[PDB]
Design a binder for this molecule. Structure first.
Ligand SMILES: Cc1ncc(COP(=O)(O)O)c(CN)c1O
Ligand SMILES: Cc1ncc(COP(=O)(O)O)c(CN)c1O
Ligand SMILES: Nc1ccccc1C(=O)C[C@H](N)C(=O)O
Ligand SMILES: Nc1ccccc1C(=O)C[C@H](N)C(=O)O
Ligand SMILES: O=C(O)c1cc(O)c2ccccc2n1
Ligand SMILES: O=C(O)c1cc(O)c2ccccc2n1
Lengths: 404, 404
């Protein structure tokens, strides 16, 4: 810096901000010849570019001043209205909720931390959970409680046990943060009984549930789950969705659905961070949904990703040594791998990269960073030939790591 | 709320957030047939729509996957390169700076608070200053020092006095926030001597200067000022600009230019708030600049707003009673009026609205909310006939208020 010790100006929170040896390594990987399974990018082959083009023409013809002018903090009214109808009809979400549009789902998480979290408040997360929710929440200095997943999602029984111990210490949970369908990073889905069980606990222990669902329409097998938000008679769930995986990430449009008193506060919080989410992208999204394009396109997304998931699953089964394990997602973008014999996947990344493959080490997906033998693999955005090849290079990497 | 006392969940900061009685009133006024001079919107007649339409076609033809995919947190590289070349050539801003793209300049204000402000840190603002900068900064609990304006902008001599008193109390300013050209809300511009004086003080007292410049290209008379950032040999100025007034607000693209060490921290801070500013809009803004459209369009903006400023100034001169004073901006969107005889402009708004005109009371533009006889008038966004008739209704309101 040209100010020398520039840190002399930084806030306490800025002084704690660092980022991040592995994320920086993976940036560089993403630009080389290596087969990277490490990214969380949807495949641009799934962007509906013909529909987008017609919508932009329509906007410049009919909606130009609306698309181009400042919008309200709450969002573009027709998008808010069309989303609530879509969510009501498609998922059974109650029309008693209000809705705010956000600058992607990530912004919704920062706003949840601003609006709910005092330093020290306790936040429950899955172990693993979505890394950038931890990063959003960390600015507000929560304490975390981690609840492990299994193949049917959050072990809610362990949450009840941790809630009872917290009670015995005179403490309680403010927010339970869940990514219950095709989790990023785990791929697994919380079963129906556990969603209802979670809501019983939310009532009994008086907490808010944040249900963050980017991946739900990316279903390749099985039957649609019930949104936790659909089961929410008390108004304790805040539902987050986003256009990122179902339209394209580049518009940065998301939504938050929940109790009107919560929504009002969230609106006031957002107002000073950005004025409004980009209205042009909101107009695009409104046409995308209201003109029936969203519904028609989702089947093409699913058709595109399904074989990529299947390819990756098939290569894992054929190439991996005993007893590596992996999840078997019904949808979404990710497969989550556990290594045997206490291998540390973060240290093993060097070896993988030398063999031409990359993945994200799972450690940072844990609030307490205490699990070291996991990896997140992405099947949406590397060439399908390179999925088979990447999995083979990974499998050989693990073989070598396992000997002396 | 469905949760009863929903408050029980809110953070300390969220408990201290409230909607404004005046802003809510003004919203309702905008939807009515009153002549409102209270808004801060640019005129959609100045949005370059035919150019925007050509850019949108070109993006779908050649840049679709870039415009639609997630982008890096720092911003779209070509936009960042083009902006630095533009700011270098046009303003003489040094190429030793870095740049980050933001979701409007408003987001840059929130990021400045996150990155520099601990509770209690001292921020200097002009009196008046831009309301939503106070709102952004307020989440971080600064103490403010207010420095009055005159017709040549911040009275930097009063700043020196206040810096000396602070020093005598063993205290320091961390940030000086300035909107030095065609101020929102005052309309005035800091002269050249004061820009250099401010930088001498920044050096002597070791603070950072935030130079927030949405309005610079909206010049109607006079000669271009020197950017404070263009005089910045020490790397102490963070320069903010935005496409909102020179393209259209709806894309929500802004930029922050300053010392590389500062910009790296800001990038890390931003990452978890929104991932990236919407890339689609960043592609549009890149073509808008790089293809020469910004430069050709700026003269049309000026040509459009100039007569509107002039009509408002003529009407003020003809209709206003003795004792009323107003600024005489060389550019921008706003004229700032001061009432005689201790009239309270917030209590007078009631009477103004009954007479068919609205304005924003100046009180909220003061950190300490301690000046009550001021008003911000906008001339960009209602029509020229309505400016004359609005100023007349305002003048008659002031006359009535002056009795008995
Ligand atoms: C669980 C989770 N939540 C939120 C997000 C943020 O996505 P966006 O901001 O693009 O809506 C992601 C990334 N798609 C995610 O995986
Ligand atoms: C002084 C000032 N700074 C920042 C902004 C926010 O602008 P935007 O977020 O649209 O760049 C405005 C409104 N144009 C303003 O008047
Ligand atoms: N490359 C990305 C781009 C955008 C959003 C996420 C990613 C990811 O890396 C995966 C997961 N979203 C994460 O936090 O790790
Ligand atoms: N946050 C506000 C609330 C009310 C009135 C003004 C403001 C502002 O910050 C000025 C802005 N240019 C406007 O649009 O009025
Ligand atoms: O996105 C990130 O900022 C990121 C991603 C990772 O995979 C990490 C792994 C270990 C430590 C920090 C990490 N940070
Ligand atoms: O004096 C006020 O009550 C006042 C006036 C305003 O213009 C406001 C604008 C935005 C937010 C709060 C506000 N409060």
């Amino acid at each position: 810096s040209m100010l020398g010790d520039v840190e002399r100006f930084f806030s306490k929170k800025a002084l704690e901000m660092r980022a991040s040896e592995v994320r920086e390594l993976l940036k560089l990987v993403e630009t080389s010849d290596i087969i990277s399974l490490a990214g969380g990018l949807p495949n641009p082959k799934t962007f509906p570019k013909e529909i987008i083009r017609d919508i932009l023409v329509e906007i410049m013809e009919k909606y130009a001043d609306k698309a181009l002018q400042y919008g309200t903090t709450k969002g573009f009214t027709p998008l808010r209205e069309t989303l609530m109808k879509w969510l009501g009809k498609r998922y059974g979400i109650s029309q008693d909720n209000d809705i705010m549009i956000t600058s992607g789902s990530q912004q919704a998480l920062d706003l949840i931390g601003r609006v709910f979290l005092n330093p020290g408040d306790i936040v429950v997360v899955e172990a693993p959970t979505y890394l950038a929710a931890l990063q959003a929440f960390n600015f507000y200095e929560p304490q975390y409680i981690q609840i492990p997943l299994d193949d049917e999602g959050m072990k809610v029984e362990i949450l009840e046990e941790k809630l009872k111990e917290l009670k015995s210490q005179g403490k309680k949970v403010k927010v339970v943060y869940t990514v219950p369908t095709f989790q990023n990073p785990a791929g697994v889905t919380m079963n129906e009984d556990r969603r209802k069980y979670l809501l019983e606990l939310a009532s009994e222990y008086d907490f808010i549930v944040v249900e963050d669902d980017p991946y739900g329409e990316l279903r390749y097998s099985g039957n649609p789950e019930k949104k936790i938000k659909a089961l929410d008679n008390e108004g304790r769930v805040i539902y987050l969705g986003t256009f990122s995986k179902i339209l394209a990430p580049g518009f940065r449009i998301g939504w938050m659905v929940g109790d009107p008193g919560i929504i009002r506060k969230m609106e006031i919080a957002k107002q000073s961070t950005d004025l409004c989410t980009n209205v042009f992208g909101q107009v695009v999204a409104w046409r995308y949904v209201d003109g029936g394009y969203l519904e028609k396109h989702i089947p093409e997304i699913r058709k595109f990703y399904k074989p990529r998931r299947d390819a990756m699953l098939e290569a894992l089964e054929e190439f991996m040594p005993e007893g590596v394990k992996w999840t078997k997602p019904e949808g979404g973008m990710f497969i989550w791998v556990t290594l045997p014999d206490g291998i540390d996947s973060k240290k093993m990344l060097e070896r993988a990269i030398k063999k031409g493959v990359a993945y994200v080490p799972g450690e940072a997906f844990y609030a307490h960073r205490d699990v070291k033998n996991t990896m997140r693999l992405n099947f949406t955005y590397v060439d399908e030939d390179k999925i088979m090849e990447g999995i083979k290079r990974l499998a050989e990497t693990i073989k070598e790591e396992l000997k002396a």
